[PDB]
């Protein structure tokens, strides 16, 4: 899976926005591939990191990090006020066929669009 | 919203399966809401637990899928291996609705991208 530009569509609350994000190499220290949006400022861009490990089981980790900028008085370069995170960690075992892993990935993907999660995440109301 | 039956369509490798799951109560000790499939055996049941904290709001979603196997010289099947999944959102106090919706949709759409469908199915680094 060679790194390449990823254009995510239908993103947003209204399902109208879309974002293009391009790779920025792999860290040799721990093999964590990184991708980010060309936001003209390195400190105020949305970034994604993906890394699959090696065994006694495999572990896939995906992190999403996007900051929110603000122009505070007394300075010219905008700083970072608040920062939104997201973490995902699959923990498949050695003897797991690809069908089971695909099932896990698909149910996780479709569970983030069901009426339960799109409500428990947007308004932070606990499920009862 | 209160817990209710959740049905998921176009699930699987080819998107030709459907997974229906129903609630299984709420644990009062730590406030996790559970859901599970009607698998007719409590041990071999795909389950999903969702829980939001109260202050740095934190949202945690945990998915457990065990797999069965015919025990040698026995009748009751045992859980040979389990597939795990975890999601942890960490929105702050002043975050608006648009930012959280954007993060959720990003995680939902990126997870079906050609990069992730190969990183997860084929276990090859990017």
């Amino acid at each position, epitope marked *: 899976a060679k790194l390449e530009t990823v254009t995510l*569509g*239908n993103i947003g609350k209204d399902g109208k*926005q*879309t*974002l293009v994000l391009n790779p920025r190499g792999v860290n040799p220290t721990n093999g964590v591939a990184s991708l980010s949006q060309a936001g003209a400022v390195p400190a105020l861009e949305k970034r994604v990191t993906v890394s699959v490990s090696q065994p006694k089981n495999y572990k896939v980790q995906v992190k999403i990090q996007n900051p929110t900028a603000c122009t505070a008085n007394g300075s010219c370069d905008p700083s970072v006020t608040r920062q939104a995170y997201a973490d995902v960690t699959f923990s498949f075992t050695q003897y797991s066929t690809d069908e089971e892993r695909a099932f896990v990935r698909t149910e996780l993907a479709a569970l983030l669009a069901s009426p339960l999660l799109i409500d428990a995440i947007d308004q932070l109301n606990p499920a009862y | 919203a209160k817990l209710e039956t959740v049905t998921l369509g176009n699930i699987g490798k080819d998107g030709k399966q459907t997974l229906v799951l129903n609630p299984r109560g709420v644990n009062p000790t730590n406030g996790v809401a559970s859901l599970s499939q009607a698998g007719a055996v409590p041990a071999l049941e795909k389950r999903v637990t969702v829980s939001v904290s109260q202050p740095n709001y934190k949202v945690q979603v945990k998915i457990q899928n065990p797999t069965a196997c015919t025990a040698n010289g026995s009748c009751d099947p045992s859980v040979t291996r389990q597939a795990y999944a975890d999601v942890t959102f960490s929105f702050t106090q002043y975050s608006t609705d648009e930012e959280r919706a954007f993060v959720r949709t990003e995680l939902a759409a990126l997870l079906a991208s050609p990069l992730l469908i190969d990183a997860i199915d084929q276990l090859n680094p990017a």
Partner: antibody
Amino acid sequence: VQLQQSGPELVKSGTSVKLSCKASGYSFTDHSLHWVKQSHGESLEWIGYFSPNNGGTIYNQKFMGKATLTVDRSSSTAYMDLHNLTSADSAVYFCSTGWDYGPFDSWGQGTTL
Amino acid sequence: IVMSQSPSSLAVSIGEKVTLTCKSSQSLLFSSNQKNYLAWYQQNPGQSPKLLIYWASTRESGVPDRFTGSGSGTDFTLTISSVKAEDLAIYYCQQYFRYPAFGGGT
């Protein structure tokens, strides 16, 4: 979000023109303000936009010479000029807005030339 | 990109299940995930047009259920579910990635 203002400009000859689009209710932080032209008849074709995150000076080909898209961020208005007016000035020039790469959400009424 | 659409005029009067066909000269699966990039606009002869469908299969808020569409790699269609007294006039189609380009007629 709504956007309006126009003016039935009826000036002749190729001296100059100044069309404007006073957009309100939205900020230029991510959105793009397109300038689709309808001509007269069939098939209105795009004329460019202004995206701060994409450059803000993307112009359609075969329209580079007679187009100039300058946007003032103080009052949140976008206006353009056409240098030469011989036969391109035919009919309405719509003013458009939308997301960064999304569809065109809402269009205000256009000037008549 | 060029968007060649079905001939300018139709002949349906009332109630008939009439479909609008659009054909592109290039693949429109620009998005990394399989999402098309078409939008269908209808323009009355008097004022500015309105958006009807984006992603070629998703309706826009505040639009009646008649308008539905299906999308393939490059051969898309718009299937209005019967026509009422005022559902006429030009039905433009547009791809809206990188350089947009309209095209078509009634």
